[PDB]
């Protein structure tokens, strides 16, 4: 249901590479949430991901809970390494 990462992107999770990871979450129909430093807001929301300010080398957890978790937690991994964010 969840998959934790480590961001090695000099940019962190901002600009388009972030708008991308949020646009690739409004696709699925489950419930995805991002958790940084123990703070949790809807990973499917811009102001939520843009409010956090995920720098570089910051471990983050993608939590999916719905009728298509595995599918979500899977493509998001692609979306991450396809954007060069975390690993």
């Amino acid at each position: 249901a969840q998959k934790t990462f480590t961001v090695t992107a000099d940019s962190g999770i901002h600009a388009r590479p972030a708008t991308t990871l949020v646009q690739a979450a409004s696709k699925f129909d489950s419930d995805i949430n991002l958790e940084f430093n123990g703070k949790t807001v809807n990973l499917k929301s811009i102001m939520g991901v843009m409010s956090l300010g995920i720098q570089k080398g910051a471990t983050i957890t993608i939590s999916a809970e719905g009728s298509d978790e595995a599918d979500a937690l899977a493509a998001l991994e692609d979306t991450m390494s396809k954007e060069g964010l975390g690993e």
Binding site: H14, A15, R16, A18, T19, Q23, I46, M47, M50, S51, L52, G53, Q55
Partner: protein, 275 residues
């Protein structure tokens, strides 16, 4: 009744900074299928107000607004608006209108204070057009507080302005070294003047950071296109863009605004213009 087209008034998109912001806007206004109608104002208080009329008239669901100086009057007119308006990378002391920015005064402090820590005596400041509320009322203070808070002479001559042009950034370095008591560290109000400060200071035969250390702002890409690489206070322009529109989307599609007065995170990117 609506038009699916939000308006945006920017000063000049031929500027890395403003264009970088315009892109955040776009991308999100796109994401929510809203057309944008961009128009520059060249920081002309008259053209600014006028542009706001023309745009409001041509029926626009919302308006994004950027200015170096939101006049006391702008607030009157932008209150009498018929549609949601949110300010981007522009500030006004009353908070009657939404606004996404960075915590300026804080970052200005955090940076100057980073140099005190580094062990510096005479810290200088090279800002832009002092008449702009974001500058004199926010960034300058930060620089002063960071100092007065460590007991250091707040010297009115150590703050020297200029326009936001790379050229100016060089003259300031000269007028600054003209001092009997030369600075050993310079805080610059913005990335491109910071580049001029490096060079100008290098031509005189000084080294960075070896002699004077420098720290910029905005963390634009010019931050990496120098030698040494500029240490800059991070301001996420595209993010200010994105979030500025998104909040407008909420206000326009009537969702629920947690806070209409936003202020995204900020940090420093230590490269080599400061050891």
């Amino acid at each position: 009744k609506k038009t699916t087209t939000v308006g945006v008034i920017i000063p000049d998109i031929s500027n890395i900074f403003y264009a970088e912001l315009a892109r955040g806007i776009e991308d999100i206004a796109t994401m929510y299928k809203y057309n944008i109608i961009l128009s520059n104002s060249d920081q002309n208080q008259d053209k600014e107000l006028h542009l706001l009329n023309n745009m409001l008239g041509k029926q626009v669901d919302g308006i994004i607004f950027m200015s170096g100086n939101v006049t006391e009057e702008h607030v009157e007119e932008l209150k009498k608006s018929p549609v949601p308006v949110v300010l981007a990378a522009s500030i006004e002391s009353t908070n009657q209108i939404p606004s996404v920015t960075i915590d300026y005064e804080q970052a200005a402090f955090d940076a100057v204070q980073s140099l005190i820590d580094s062990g510096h005596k005479n810290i200088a400041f090279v800002s832009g057009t002092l008449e702009e509320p974001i500058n004199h009322a926010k960034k300058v203070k930060g620089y002063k507080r960071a100092l007065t808070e460590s007991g250091l002479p707040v010297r009115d001559s150590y703050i020297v302005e200029g326009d936001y042009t790379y050229d100016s950034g060089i003259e300031a370095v000269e007028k600054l070294l003209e001092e009997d008591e030369k600075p050993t560290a310079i805080f610059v109000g913005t990335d491109e003047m910071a580049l001029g400060v490096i060079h100008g200071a290098q031509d005189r035969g000084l080294n960075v950071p070896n002699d004077l250390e420098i720290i910029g702002f905005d963390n634009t890409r010019l931050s990496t296109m120098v030698r040494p690489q500029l240490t800059s206070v991070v301001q996420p322009m595209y993010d200010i863009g994105a979030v500025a529109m998104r909040l407008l989307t909420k206000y326009m599609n009537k969702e629920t605004v947690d806070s209409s007065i936003v202020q995204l995170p900020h940090r420093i990117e230590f490269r080599q213009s400061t050891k």
